[PDB]
Amino acid sequence: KRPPGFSPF
């Protein structure tokens, strides 16, 4: 769903 490197917050 989201791009690489991105994390939940």
Swiss-Prot record:
<feature type="site" description="Cleavage; by ACE">
    <location>
        <begin position="8"/>
        <end position="9"/>
    </location>
</feature>
<feature type="modified residue" description="4-hydroxyproline; partial">
    <location>
        <position position="4"/>
    </location>
</feature>
<protein>
    <recommendedName>
        <fullName>Lysyl-bradykinin</fullName>
    </recommendedName>
</protein>
